[PDB]
Nucleic acid binder design. Structure first.
Ligand code: CA
Ligand code: CA
Ligand code: K
Ligand code: K
Lengths: 307, 322
DNA sequence: TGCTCCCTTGTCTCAGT
DNA sequence: TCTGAGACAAGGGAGCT
């Protein structure tokens, strides 16, 4: 995601009762689930099979509210994202195969994005293969995503609904703005600028319109001492802070590389509608028995009301 | 003062009403008044309004006399070298001076003027050999005064106590601090405080990056002193097994010290810092101060001359006070 | 290879002391 | 060359007048 972006976007959120989600097709961004379950479920070191337990719980929550989910997994890691993150617990191919086997037995379709899952999710919604995106990753907006359902897996009666239109109307931010805002705040595709947090990054986009103007202002004022004498409080304070943080803004700011990565992510344009099956009780018993030692009786009480 | 020391000491404070101070002899640390007035009282343009030192000293004298306090004013003499060097570093640092690799003045005339003003009020004053706070502590110790009025936390490090803080905020009360309440409630004595300053910073030392009020207090409490703290840092340096057997406090503290690239060298703790606070240059004279009565005729003309106040304007304020 | 929340700290600026 | 409070931001660790 973009650092601090959820705080910025938060006040545009609207609460949606889960029951309204019945029969809705939702793209589910599952890209980091296995890793998170690994880190978050431990003992008195990581619990074995937390990926099975974790997926099972959430799949159940989705089906309980009659959501039709399509799961999305990461393909590869884009170069810009490697380079950025290039500045104990591992996700094995088995873990992935297992949760995928689990989804198939639930009758739930899944895909592996060519690259980032959030990017693929936005694509699914653009092609009308889904009606909404379930994700907690704020990168999704920069990839074109709207109709975002955040906090699906907190224990709450509701979920937070975000859309690009509300962001545009309430914060003045369009997609290009959010992409430029990322280069102040930081994201997986850029380190942003040291000293620029949610308050001043928003002020910069609002006062300067775009990073080109912001940079020209910065560079021009550094050159011409007379231009500085006319500067207001916002500019004067901002200038000092940037120089103190050793900020240099050159030819590669804003980044065309960063702009491309968000505007043209590698995605699958396939328009085949997803197929939702039914949970297979017999195969789900044997799966939970094999993997967790759940007696069929135990799977039954949970699964039978869901079918 | 010591950075953040008032945040640390604050909760041991006792709120005290001015009327409880009637007839008390109070040392007044006036060492930065003129400068503060110069900086805090400004033009619509942005300049210092002329003679704010006279206006400032005047209003504060009136508050003291109003509550029947018998003040003796204490001014700085020299500036100790250690204090001099650190202050220029802070000045340059905040002007923007890069410190590592990439990735309005007070004139003798102003002093003479506020001193003539005190004399015409009948109020005694002295000039300390060096720091005014240290001389204030010595006056109390010698029973030449009953309390100390200052906002500078260094006073405790110079052995002061019975400190009346925020006397000149525009408020209905004042905050009282003393050495014993601090020792009882915080476990801090004079030597502890002198070592805290080397973590937190003061006019005599830069302190350690990453050490704020919370961590500094914990270091003093957990290690007792800076020698033990330095010894602990140095002995668990490359013992990877001992570092596993360090509790949470030590483990986190070691990592923070490492992250902040902290070096504790042979001058840590500092003998020189210890001496500046323990043995400051003070005047041990035991002669009692003499309080006089305010001279209306001389105050009238003084205010006339320095501020253009008509006599009746001075009378309206001074007469009820007299 | 994750996240958000909370705690602590650094830095700066305006108004007051 | 001041003080004091507040706003903003960086970073770490725990637990999911
Ligand atoms: Ca992402
Ligand atoms: Ca001092
Ligand atoms: K930033
Ligand atoms: K410090």
């Amino acid at each position: 995601g973009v650092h601090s972006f959820w705080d910025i976007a938060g006040p545009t959120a609207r609460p949606v009762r889960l029951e309204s989600l019945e029969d809705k097709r939702m793209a589910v961004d599952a890209s980091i689930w296995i890793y998170q379950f690994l880190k978050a479920v431990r003992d008195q070191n990581a619990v074995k099979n937390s990926h099975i337990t974790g997926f099972f719980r959430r799949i159940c929550k989705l089906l309980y509210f009659g959501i039709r989910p399509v799961f999305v997994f990461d393909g590869g890691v884009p170069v810009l994202k490697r380079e950025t993150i290039r500045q104990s617990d591992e996700v094995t191919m088995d873990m992935i195969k297992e949760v995928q086997e689990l989804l198939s037995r639930f009758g739930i379709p899944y895909i592996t994005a060519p690259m980032e899952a959030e990017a693929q999710c936005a694509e699914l919604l653009q092609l009308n293969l889904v009606d909404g995106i379930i994700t907690d990753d704020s990168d999704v907006f920069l990839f074109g995503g709207t109709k975002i359902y955040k906090n699906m897996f907190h224990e709450k009666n509701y979920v937070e609904f975000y859309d690009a239109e509300s962001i545009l109307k309430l914060l003045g931010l369009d997609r290009k703005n959010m992409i430029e805002l990322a280069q102040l705040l930081g994201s997986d595709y850029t380190n942003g600028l040291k000293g620029m947090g949610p308050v001043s990054s928003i002020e910069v986009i609002a006062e300067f319109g775009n990073l080109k103007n912001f940079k020209d202002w910065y560079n021009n004022g550094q050159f011409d001492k007379r231009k500085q004498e006319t500067e207001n409080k916002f500019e004067k304070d901002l200038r000092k802070k940037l120089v103190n943080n050793e900020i240099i803004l050159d030819d590669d700011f804003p980044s065309v590389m960063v702009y491309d990565a968000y505007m043209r992510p590698e995605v699958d344009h396939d328009t085949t509608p997803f197929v939702w099956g039914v949970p297979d009780l017999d195969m789900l018993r044997s799966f939970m028995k094999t993997q967790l030692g759940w007696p069929h009786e135990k799977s039954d009480e949970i699964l039978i009301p869901l079918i």
